[PDB]
């Protein structure tokens, strides 16, 4: 049940994340920034599988199965220049519409619906160029209004264009908002479409990202490129289970089966140990940790990528993937230690899941202290607080209707009352999502069937 | 049927022929002196080719059989200073001191018919020197009424002289958006009736679509008429690649006659070339054959200013250069029929002709071209031609209401009846085109 | 089941062993597997009637052990258990 | 009557005959320069049958290669065994008919039919024991489908007693080169049904399938297909030439392979005893190509070369009859025609050829007739043929004859 996945870069942050992910994949599979594989074509014995992510046009060239779509051509041109021949110039969409006229989800949705024909034709071409398909991976970057609107339009097109494909999305949330009202409006409008159509959604709060980037790096100044490098490494780790096929998980659908118990609960929380493929990765061999300590760090709140705010958190599906020389006895010990420390609901007896992957044979081998890394994905309702931030912002600002002169243009509604009703409906649907989450956090979410047959 | 007589009429036709002979010399690596160039090959001529267009002499110097006819001494002086005149014979070219008219008035009048007898014996003497004849090739732009008028006169005389070989006519169509000449739609409509009675097969190529190709595919900032002549040379060279170089599946000129002329009155095949891109992009990008075959159906490669998706599919041809085998173009048409890009019919659909040629495509140094070992030249018969026919007919009818110039035409060599007959004939061809297209 | 053998021969591309198939070493090594189906049941489901039969040849038969007709069917019962799962 | 004449024409029949001679020399042992290399006497007999004993022990094959292209004769000469050929054995004309059977057998073929008939008459005068004529051409291409049809008609009018076995490459419905291709093919077969005695169904799509399934050939070129058809032809001609337990003649095939003289088409298959029978009765190994579960078997025949057991082949025939009595008609009631050659095939321990007559040739006829009708309803490609001289009444008569043959094949229901 393993199929190819096509990458969708949207907005400036999405384009940067996609560029970083493709550079990381090229470094892992020895492809480089030129598009031509650094490994000779005579060595066809490859333990990995670049076919789900790299279209093999020529024997030595591997074009990534990705499409970039942005309103700002500067970032696209910069990516195309720094990757000479690596990316496909035909998969770059700018529409020649100029710079984004604001940071509004309305403008984003408008610029998506206006040129929906071009992006849909490019998607059809990319699908025709391949044979086996499973789904897309969309980068919303909801911090930007134009990118969030473009992602919402792409999702609203893909849901009814390819309903038999599983859709995964990555929504990057900012730590502190400059325009709190506009950014909250954009994020809630994107989460509306996420609830409506998206199958799987992974959140990335920038607060924990900045914390990790200030902790593990030596430079106090934080840059957006090595900030997005963290999400790049996370996406690489979660796609490793398909790139280097393991013996338990070898498909995106098989991975998401144990992570999505219901279409309502489709928000995850990631966590990773101190990375080893980032820029400043020399301070990793001084910890002297084993796989048990790796699991402890994965379950620790200091290594999560989102704001934990752990106040007796209710876990539903906890999954972990360990890459390196892993010991089964140590895995059993870590599982025994975590089953007595992780709060589990009384209605579901499902425990945490462990998977062991394979390390890349061409990546630089690390010393015995951090030669083994780990990734954790937990179905926790702690994201309802990150959502309630923007929810209470909406509740405290919507009483007046500020910044209404920006969401009225571009979209299909030019009046104030229609935009107000749309925002009210979006607030209602996110409130219902939060209510479903806090209801699943309780035991009645399984006693409902016991009381009513 | 081993020789094809090519005739260059009009200014644009003379420039197209020069680039055609230049690329013909570039493919075989032929220099102005030659003797073959030089005599070591096998297969650069002899053997065929060159044995279809270049006349073989006793010394061995290949003389390209071309008849440059024009009434403008400037173009004739331009073609004579270059080494092309040394390649041709001084008696093959015809010189004119005063231009006929602007543009179709005297081009088809009896004044242009005075030299008709002169070029007739020249063709008879040229056919007597060589042996065999496969067809008559014509290169004149429909924008210039002088080249269109003289080209139609030569076409009518050749039909009544031999009438045994199919008459090929490469016509250049002006831009349907902007027309520099005010009588340009009039010269085209009056010529459509002439090429209807005389030509057995035509060729419709637009200038605006070519300029869009060089600006998008070749990525050049300033288009030029020499760039259009080079692309036409690559087109003409592709249709006769099997007649010039042997291939695994050699196609004949009559094979094009039995594929591109599929109805009692249908002699209008559309030509498309793929892949065409920049030389730099060709070094960076490397597409598959399935991607190239899908590119032949795009509106850009069709060399026409109309969308081919609305058109209805008819019998087509696809010639391939270099190393091409059956499945990669078959699995392409396997998926092309599965994609259903162009709306098929119940009569034609099984009409994707596949022709293979060993000669790889060559890129001219003046105009960029996608450097690829295999090229695709698709000769389609999609029903978008009537859309271009009705487009120029509406501008023709809108103008003909007043037309501001009828006194000059009815006084020199024409009348209002001939304009009405050409209008009714063109409307009859469009009506028959829609009936033969929408009957499925 | 001859069209079944045909689609099995076609599915070698969709199989995850394309990197090994590209090399001439695994060529005919992948083919040594026999596409034989033993009918188990009268009119049962295709999953139940499907059976995997492997035949070994020297010099690999003298070393490796497979589902021999006169053996204990170790690989057969293991494959049946994994097939039910 | 052991000697057999070979005629080759069309865009692919030239290479078909070239590969035929190549495989014949590879079978019996001979150099391309005419030097005898076989051992000892049966090879000299086969050389007297097919080739010509020239001076200094030279051997030139008795072949009539005709086509409208000098490149074709140049290619078949540049081929390995293609060097020595009498200038009278091959005559090529100029220049082309353009995929039109009408023009091909009216103008491009009539100008050289006199020369080719004089050549074949001199060859028949020099060949005393001639029995059959093996035609190799492509029914798809109109030029070849016209030239070969005209030649077959002329040879039928000249020597009506000599057998006429054709290996015409049938056009494929998926091969969508020219719409006039199946139309010329059916116009050719409308006369071939009366001008020829035996025809072997060879489809381009069938060859593509049988090479993509076995050879895993990513791109099927005509070369390997002609090589496989050449191996099949060498097998079926050695079934008669080479010594065996029972030799089958062309007259024997005519009097045992078809119940009524109207039917002349036979579906062929090659292998590679129980596995050979399975391959023969499977659909993926036929070159017609028909479906055994769809078509109703009217008659079958299986010839074998190598060390094969008559008891094994009889048991296999009995088992296949008991398991496919639904397709096997009940008025035979049990169809069987087995020939055995004790000699071993070239490079193989045992080889097998299979011939059948099912109810799918009529289905292919229905397909090509529907193509012709739904193509000529809009008068497509009719001005060319009206200028040539053919008639819509003649086309309708051809279609009516095809429908009559379809009724004869449904008489005789499916
Ligand atoms: N952490 C992080 N955030 C980014 C990055 N790039 C963009 N962002 C987010 O983008 C916001 C700034 O707006 P822009 O980057 O211009 O996004 P936009 O306004 O939609 O413009 P476009 O993305 O070009 O459509 C910031 O609040 C960031 O949260 C990045 O590389 N790292």
Domain tally, chain B: 3
- Nearest CB partner across the interface for C19, out of A2, A46, A250: A46
* β-strand partners of B9: B69
CATH tag, D1-259: 3.40.50.1440
Q: How far apart are CA A297 and CA A287, in angstroms?
A: 12
Residue A136 bridge partners (DSSP):
A6
Cβ–Cβ contact B335 with D under 8 A: no
Among A374, A376, A368, A229, smallest CA distance to A287 is for A368
User: Rounded to an integer, what distance in angstroms lies between the CA atom of residue D258 and that of residue D256?
Assistant: 6
Contacts of B417 (CB under 8 A, 6+ apart): none
Chain A contact partners (≥3 CB pairs within 8 A): B, C
Nearest protein CA to atom 28 of ligand 1, as residue: A143
Question: Could you tell me if residue B340 is left (phi over 0), alpha (psi between -120 and 50 degrees) or otherwise beta?
Answer: left
C-alpha span between B193 and B401 (Å, rounded): 20
A338 shares its domain with A373: yes
Which run of H or E residues covers position A450? Answer: helix A444-451
Chains D and C touch (3+ CB pairs under 8 A): yes
C-alpha distances (whole Å) from D409 to each of A25, A246, D259, D295, D338 are 63, 59, 11, 11, 24
User: Are C2 and D284 a contacting pair at CB < 8 A?
Assistant: yes
Are residues B276 and B263 located together in one domain of the fold?
no
In a domain, A353, yes or no: yes
* Domain termination site, one of A200, A235, A268: A268
User: Is B423 in the D-facing interface, judged by CB distances under 8 Å?
Assistant: no
CA distances from A372 to A273, A331, A368, B220 (A): 10, 12, 8, 53
Q: Whose CA is nearest to atom 15 of ligand 1?
A: A12
**Dihedral angle at the C-alpha atoms of A414, A420, A423, A428, nearest 10 degrees?**
-140
CB distance B81 to B68 below 8 Å? no
The C-alpha atoms of residue D186 and residue D207 are separated, in whole angstroms, by: 20
Report residue D349 CA to chain centroid gap.
25
Contact C2 D282 (CB under 8 A): yes
The pair of structure tokens assigned to B196 is 């209807």
A133 three-state secondary structure? strand
Cβ neighbours of residue D354 under 8 Å, at least 6 residues apart?
D268, D269, D270, D271, D280, D300, D301, D302, D303
- Please report, for residues A427, B241, C32, D274, D355, the alpha-carbon distance to residue D271 in angstroms, rounded to integers and kept in the order given: 72, 40, 20, 11, 12
The whole-angstrom separation of Cα D202 and Cα B419 is: 56
What stretches of B253-361 adopt beta strand conformation (E)? Answer: 270-274, 316-320, 352-356
Tokens of B131: 């042996």
- CATH number for B319: 3.30.1330.20
Of B281, B287, B294, the CB nearest to A57: B287
Report angle CA D333, D337, D342 to the nearest 5 degrees.
Answer: 155
Write down the domain spans for chain D: 1-259, 260-360, 361-414
B410 and B283 assigned to the same domain? no
Residues A110, A182 share a domain: yes
Which among D332, D337, D229, D340 has a CA at the least distance from the CA of D288?
D229
Q: Are residues B188 and B327 in the same domain?
A: no
Q: Which residues does chain A have within 8 Å of residue C16's beta carbon, measured at their own beta carbons?
A: 2, 49, 245, 250
- Give the C-alpha separation, D290 to D358, whole Å: 8
Angle at A357 between CA A356 and CA A358, to 5 degrees: 135
Pair A142, A261 in one domain: yes
Which token pair is C6? 């045909």
Indicate the residue among A336, A354, A380 that finishes a domain.
A380
Do residues A148 and A93 share a domain? yes
Q: Are residues A155 and A294 in the same domain?
A: no
Whether B335 and B433 share a structural domain = no
Distant-in-sequence, close-in-space partners of B419: CB < 8 Å, separation ≥ 6:
B186, B189, B190, B400, B409
Q: Is there a common fold for D1-259 and D361-414?
A: no
In Å, what is the CA distance from B378 to each residue of A206, A250, A251, B278, B296? 54, 43, 42, 20, 7
Tell me the HSE value of A209 on the side-chain side, using a 13 A CA sphere.
24
Count Cβ–Cβ pairs < 8 Å, chain A vs chain B. Answer: 16
For testing contact with chain B, the best of D99, D175, D215 (most B CBs within 10 A): D99
In a domain, A434, yes or no: yes
The answer to whether B63 and B57 have CB atoms below 8 angstroms apart is yes
| DSSP structure string for C33-80 | S--B----SSS--HHHH---B----TTTTTTS----TTS--HHHHHHH
Rounded CA-CA distance B305/B210 in Å is 10
Contact A21/A86 with Cβ under 8 angstroms? no
Kindly state whether residues B191 and B326 are assigned to the same domain: no
Token pair recorded at residue B304: 């026409």
User: What values do phi and psi take at B280, rounded to 5?
Assistant: -70, -45
- Do the beta carbons of residue A190 and residue A153 sit within 8 Å? no
CA distance A360 to A47: 8
Q: Which residues of B touch A85 (CB under 8 A)?
A: 284-285
**For residue D3, what are the β-bridge partners?**
D130
Q: CB within 6 Å of ligand 1 — which residues?
A: A 11-13, 16, 70-72, 100, 103, 143-147, 174, 206, 224, 227-228
Q: Are residues A233 and A136 in the same domain?
A: yes
How, if at all, do strands D350-357 and D265-271 pair? antiparallel
Distance CA B24, CA B405 (A): 42
What is the spatial distance between Cα A174 and Cα A377, in angstroms, rounded to a whole number?
20
Name residues whose C-beta falls within 8 Å of residue B135's C-beta, 6 or more positions apart in sequence: B1, B4, B5, B165, B166, B167, B168, B253
On whether the CB atoms of residues A126 and A6 are closer than 8 A, the answer is: yes
Q: Indicate yes or no: CB of C2 within 8 angstroms of CB of D213.
A: no
Read off the tokens for B113: 């018919």
How many residues appear in chain B?
440
Ligand 1 atom closest to residue A72's alpha carbon, by position in its atom list: 24
Same domain as B191, residue B86: yes
Residue A452 forms part of a structural domain: no
Residue ranges of chain A whose CB lies within 8 Å of a chain B CB:
57-58, 61, 84-85, 88-89, 128-129
Instruction: Supply the range of the domain harboring residue A312.
Output: 269-380
Distance, in angstroms, between D179 CA and closest chain C CA?
31
Q: Is B436 on the interface with D (CB under 8 A)?
A: yes
Q: Which of A12, A171, A231 to mutate to test the pocket of ligand 1 (most atoms within 8 A of CB)?
A: A12
Report the C-alpha gap between B332 and B235 in whole angstroms: 22
In a domain, A407, yes or no: yes
The CATH class for the domain spanning D260-360 reads alpha beta
For B292, the closest chain A residue by CA position comes to A129
Same domain (yes/no): B214, B333: no
HSE-up (13 A, CA, CB side) for residue B235: 26
Backbone region of residue A244 per phi and psi (left: phi > 0; alpha: psi in -120 to 50; beta: other values) = beta
Q: Which of A58, A84, A89 sits opposite B286 (nearest CB)?
A: A58
Is residue A453 in a domain? Answer: no
Region at A395 (left for phi over 0; alpha for psi -120 to 50; beta for the rest): alpha
Ligand 1 mean position, distance from CA A72 (Å): 11
Assess whether A150 and A287 both reside in one domain. no
Q: Are A241 and A355 in contact (CB under 8 A)?
A: yes
Contact D378 B354 (CB under 8 A): no
Count CB neighbours of A157 within 10 A.
17
CA distance C22 to chain A (A): 7
Taking CB atoms and an 8 Å cutoff, what residues of chain C touch A47?
A: 19
Considering only alpha carbons, which residue of chain A is nearest residue B288? A57
Are A244 and A337 in a shared domain? no
Separation CA A228–CA D60 (nearest Å): 78
Structure tokens, D385: 């043929």
Chain B residue with the nearest C-alpha to that of A84? B284
B263 three-state secondary structure: strand
User: B102 and B61: one domain?
Assistant: yes
Whether residues A57 and A175 share a domain: the answer is yes
Q: Are D112 and D396 in contact (CB under 8 A)?
A: no
Minimum distance, in Å, between the CA of residue A57 and any CA atom of chain B: 6
* Integer Cα distance of D249 and D163 in angstroms: 10
Residue positions counted in chain D: 414
Judged by CB atoms closer than 8 Å, whether chains meet at C6 and D284 is answered as yes
Pairwise CA distance, residues D294 & D414, whole Å: 8
Which DSSP category does B353 fall into?
E
Contact A295, A334 (CB under 8 A): yes
Indicate the burial class of D241 (C-beta count within 10 angstroms; 0-12, 13-18, 19 or more): buried
Residue at which a domain ends, from A268, A293, A312 = A268
The 3-class SS string of chain D reads: CCEEEEEECCCCHHHHHHHHHHHHHHHHCECCCCCECCCCCHHHHHHHHHEEECHHHCEEECEEECCCCHHHHHHHHHCCCCCCCCCCCCCCCCCCCCCCHHHHHHHHCHHHHHHHHHHHHHHHHHCCCEEEEEEECECCCHHHHHHHHHHHHHHHHHCCCCEEEECCEECCCCCCCCCHHHHHHHHHHHHHHHHCCEEEEEEHHHHHHHHHHHCCCCCCCHHHHHHHHHHHHHHHHHHHHCCCCCCCCHHHHHHHCCCCCCCCEEEEEEECCHHHHHHHCCCCCECCCCCCCCCCCCEEEEEEEECCCHHHHHHHHHHHHHHCCCCCCCCCCCCCCEEEECCCCCCCCEEEEEEEECCCHHHHHHHHHHHHHHHHCCCCCCHHHHHHCCCHHHHHHHHHHHHHHHHHHCCCCC
Same domain, A161 and A256: yes
Q: Å from D282 to nearest chain C CA?
A: 8
| Main-chain phi, psi angles of D151, to 5 degrees | -65, -40
Alpha helices in B262-320 (DSSP H): 279-284, 289-295
Residues B69 and B202 in one domain: yes
Instruction: Write out the CATH class of domain D361-414.
Output: mainly alpha
Alpha carbon distance A229, A219 (integer Å): 15
Atom of ligand 1 minimally distant from the CA of A16: 31
Ligand 1 center to A16 CA (angstroms): 9
CA distances from D229 to D18, D19, D142 (A): 11, 9, 21
Alpha helices in B217-288 (DSSP H): 225-239, 241-244, 253-260, 279-284
Give yes or no for a contact between D151 and D116, defined as CB atoms under 8 angstroms apart: yes
- Give the helix/strand (H/E) hosting A7: strand A4-10
Looking up residue B258, the CATH number of its domain turns out to be: 3.40.50.1440
Alpha-carbon distance D241 to D38, whole Å? 15
D173, D139 in Cβ contact below 8 A? no
Closest-CA residue of C relative to A50 is C19
Q: Do A371 and A286 belong together in one domain?
A: yes
Burial (CB < 10 A; 0-12, 13-18, 19+), residue D332, is middle
Specify the pairing of strand B166-173 against strand A315-323. Answer: unpaired
Do D and A touch, counting CB pairs below 8 Å (3 needed)? no
Residues of B annotated as catalytic are 255
Same domain, B259 and B110: yes
CA-nearest of B141, B153, B129, B234 to B180 is B141
For residue A31, tell me if it sits in a domain.
yes
* d(CA D286, nearest CA chain C) in Å: 14
Q: Which chains have at least 3 CB atom pairs separated by less than 8 Å from chain B? A: A, D
DSSP letter at A89?
Answer: G
Cα separation, B147 vs B137, whole angstroms: 14
What dihedral angle (degrees, nearest 10) is formed by the CA atoms of B370, B371, B377, B378? Answer: -50
- B326 and B434 co-located in one domain: no
Task: Give chain A's domain count.
Answer: 3
Residue B294 with chain A: CB contacts under 8 Å: 128
Note whether A277 and A253 are same-domain residues.
no
Rounded CA separation B363/B237 (Å) = 12
Give the structural domain span for B323: 270-384
Instruction: State the Cα angle at B222 between B220 and B227, rounded to 5°.
Output: 75
Q: Are residues B85 and B95 in the same domain?
A: yes
Question: Distance between CA atoms of B138 and B103, rounded to whole angstroms?
Answer: 19
């Amino acid at each position: 049940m393993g199929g190819e996945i096509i990458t969708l870069q949207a907005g400036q942050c999405g384009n940067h994340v996609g560029k970083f992910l493709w550079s990381q994949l090229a470094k892992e599979h020895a492809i480089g920034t030129d598009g031509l594989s650094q490994l000779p074509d005579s060595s066809t014995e490859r333990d990995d599988d670049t076919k789900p992510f790299f279209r093999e046009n020529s024997r030595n060239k591997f074009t990534p199965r990705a499409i970039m779509m942005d309103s700002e051509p500067s970032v696209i041109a910069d990516v195309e220049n720094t990757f000479r021949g690596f990316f496909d110039p035909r998969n770059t969409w700018v529409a020649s519409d100029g710079a984004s006229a604001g940071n509004s989800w309305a403008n984003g949705y408008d610029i998506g619906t206006r040129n929906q024909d071009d992006i849909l034709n490019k998607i059809d071409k990319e699908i025709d160029s391949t044979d086996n398909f499973e789904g897309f991976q969309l980068l919303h970057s909801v911090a930007g209004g134009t990118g969030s609107g473009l992602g919402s339009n792409l999702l609203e097109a893909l849901c009814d264009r390819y309903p038999k494909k599983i859709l995964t999305t990555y929504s990057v949330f900012p730590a502190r908002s400059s325009e709190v009202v506009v950014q909250s409006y954009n994020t809630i409008l994107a989460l509306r479409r996420l609830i409506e159509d998206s199958d799987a959604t992974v959140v990335f709060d920038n607060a924990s990202l900045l914390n990790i980037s200030g902790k593990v790096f030596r430079n106090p100044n934080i840059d957006l490129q090595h900030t997005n490098q963290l999400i790049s490494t996370i996406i690489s780790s979660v796609t490793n289970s398909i790139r280097f096929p393991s013996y338990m998980y070898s498909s995106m659908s098989s991975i998401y089966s144990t992570l999505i118990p219901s279409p309502e609960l489709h928000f995850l929380s990631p966590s990773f140990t101190p990375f080893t493929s980032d820029y400043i990765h020399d301070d990793i061999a001084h910890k002297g940790h084993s796989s048990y300590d790796v699991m402890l760090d994965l379950l620790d709140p200091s290594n999560s990528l989102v704001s934990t705010a752990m106040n007796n958190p209710t876990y539903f599906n906890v999954y972990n993937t360990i890459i390196g020389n892993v010991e089964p006895r140590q895995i059993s010990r870590a599982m025994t230690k975590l089953q007595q420390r992780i709060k589990f609901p009384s209605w579901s007896s499902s425990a945490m899941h462990v998977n062991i992957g394979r390390r890349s044979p061409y990546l630089p081998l690390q010393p015995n202290e951090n030669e083994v890394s780990g990734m954790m994905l937990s179905n926790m309702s702690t994201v309802v607080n990150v959502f309630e931030n923007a929810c209470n912002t909406f509740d405290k600002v919507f009483a007046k209707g500020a910044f209404l002169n920006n969401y009225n243009v571009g979209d299909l509604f030019q009046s104030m009352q229609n935009v107000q009703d749309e925002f009210a409906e979006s607030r209602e649907v996110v409130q219902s999502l939060m209510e479903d989450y806090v209801a699943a956090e309780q035991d009645s979410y399984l006693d409902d069937v016991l009381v009513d047959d | 049927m081993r020789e094809v007589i090519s005739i260059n009429v009009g200014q644009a036709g003379c420039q197209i022929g020069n680039a055609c002979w230049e690329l013909y010399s570039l493919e075989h690596g032929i220099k102005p002196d030659g003797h073959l160039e030089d005599g070591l090959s096998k297969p650069k001529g002899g053997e065929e080719g060159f044995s279809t267009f270049f006349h073989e002499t006793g010394y061995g110097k290949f003389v390209p059989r071309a008849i440059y006819v024009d009434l403008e001494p400037n173009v004739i002086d331009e073609v004579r200073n270059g080494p092309y005149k040394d390649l041709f014979h001084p008696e093959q070219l015809i010189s004119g001191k005063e231009d006929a008219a602007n543009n179709y008035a005297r081009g088809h009048y009896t004044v242009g018919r005075e030299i008709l007898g002169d070029v007739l014996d020249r063709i008879r003497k040229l056919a007597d020197q060589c042996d065999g004849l496969q067809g008559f090739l014509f290169t004149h732009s429909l924008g210039g009424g002088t080249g269109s008028g003289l080209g139609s006169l030569l076409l009518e005389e050749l039909s009544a002289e031999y009438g045994k070989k199919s008459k090929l006519e490469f016509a250049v169509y002006p831009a349907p958006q902007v027309s520099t000449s005010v009588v340009e739609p009039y010269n085209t409509v009056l010529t459509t009736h002439t090429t209807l009675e005389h030509a057995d097969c035509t060729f419709m190529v637009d200038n605006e679509a070519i300029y869009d190709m060089c600006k998008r595919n070749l990525d050049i900032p300033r288009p030029s008429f020499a760039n259009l002549n080079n692309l036409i040379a690559q087109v003409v060279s592709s249709v006769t690649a099997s007649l010039r170089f042997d291939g695994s599946l050699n196609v004949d000129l009559n094979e094009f006659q039995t594929n591109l002329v599929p109805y009692p009155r249908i002699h209008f095949p559309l030509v498309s070339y793929s892949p065409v891109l920049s030389k730099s992009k060709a070094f960076h990008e490397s597409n598959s054959v399935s991607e190239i075959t899908n590119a032949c159906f795009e509106p850009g490669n069709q060399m026409v200013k109309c969308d081919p998706r609305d058109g209805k599919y008819m019998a087509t041809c696809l010639l391939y250069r270099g190393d091409v085998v059956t499945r990669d173009v078959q699995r392409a048409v396997e998926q092309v029929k599965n994609k259903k890009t162009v709306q098929l019919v119940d009569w034609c659909p099984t009409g994707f002709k596949i022709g293979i040629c060993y000669e790889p495509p060559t890129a001219t140094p003046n105009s960029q071209l996608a450097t690829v070992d295999r090229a695709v030249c698709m000769l389609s018969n999609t029903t978008s031609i009537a859309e271009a026919w009705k487009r120029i007919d509406r501008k023709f009818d809108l103008m003909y209401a007043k037309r501001a110039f009828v006194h000059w035409y009815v006084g020199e060599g024409m009348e209002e009846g001939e304009f009405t007959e050409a209008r009714e004939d063109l409307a009859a061809l469009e009506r028959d085109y829609i009936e033969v297209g929408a009957d499925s | 089941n001859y069209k079944l053998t045909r689609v099995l021969q076609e599915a070698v591309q969709l199989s995850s062993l394309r990197h090994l198939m590209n090399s001439p070493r695994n060529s005919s090594v992948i083919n040594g597997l026999d596409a034989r189906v033993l009918d188990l049941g009268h009119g049962s489901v295709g999953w139940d009637v499907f059976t995997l039969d492997y035949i070994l040849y020297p010099p690999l038969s003298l070393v490796l052990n497979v589902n021999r007709p006169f053996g204990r069917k170790e690989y057969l019962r293991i494959f049946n258990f994994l097939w039910r799962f | 009557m052991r000697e057999i004449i070979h005629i080759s024409t069309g865009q692919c029949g030239n290479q078909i005959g070239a590969a035929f001679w190549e495989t014949i020399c590879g079978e019996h042992g001979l150099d391309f320069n005419g030097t005898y290399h076989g051992h000892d006497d049966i090879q000299k007999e086969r050389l007297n049958v097919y080739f010509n004993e020239a001076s200094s022990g030279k051997w030139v094959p008795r072949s009539i290669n005709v086509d409208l292209e000098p490149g074709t004769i140049d290619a078949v000469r540049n081929s390995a065994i293609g060097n020595l050929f009498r200038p009278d054995n091959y005559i090529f004309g100029q220049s082309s008919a353009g995929n039109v059977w009408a023009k091909g057998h009216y103008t491009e073929g009539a100008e050289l039919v006199d020369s080719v008939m004089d050549v074949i008459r001199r060859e028949a005068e020099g060949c005393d024991s001639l029995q059959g004529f093996q035609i190799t051409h492509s029914l798809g291409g109109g030029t070849g489908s016209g030239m070969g049809t005209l030649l077959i008609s002329k040879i039928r009018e000249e020597f009506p007693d000599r057998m006429m076995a054709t290996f015409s490459v049938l056009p494929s419905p998926k091969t969508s080169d020219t719409v006039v291709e199946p139309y010329n093919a059916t116009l050719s077969v409308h006369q071939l049904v009366e001008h020829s005695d035996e025809t072997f169904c060879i489809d381009n799509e069938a060859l593509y399938d049988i090479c993509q399934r076995t050879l895993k050939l990513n791109q099927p070129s005509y070369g390997d297909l002609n090589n496989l058809v050449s191996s099949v032809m060498s097998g079926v001609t050695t079934s008669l030439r080479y010594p065996g337990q029972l030799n089958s003649d062309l007259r024997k095939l005519a009097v045992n392979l078809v119940p009524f003289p109207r039917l002349h088409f036979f579906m062929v298959g090659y292998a590679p005893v129980p596995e050979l029978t399975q391959q023969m009765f499977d659909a993926k190994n036929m070159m017609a190509a028909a479906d055994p579960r769809n078509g109703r078997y009217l008659t079958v025949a299986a010839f074998f070369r190598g060390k094969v057991s008559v008891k094994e082949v009889e048991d296999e025939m009995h088992k296949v009859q008991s398991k496919n009595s639904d397709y096997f008609v009940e008025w035979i009631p049990n169809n069987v025609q087995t020939a055995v050659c004790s000699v071993a095939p070239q490079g193989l321990d045992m080889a097998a050829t299979f011939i059948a007559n099912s109810t799918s040739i009529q289905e292919l006829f229905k397909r090509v007739g529907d193509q012709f009708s739904a193509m000529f309803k809009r008068k497509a490609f009719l001005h060319w043929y009206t200028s040539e001289g053919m008639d819509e009444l003649e086309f309708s008569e051809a279609e009516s004859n095809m429908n009559d043959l379809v009724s004869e094949y449904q008489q005789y229901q499916e």
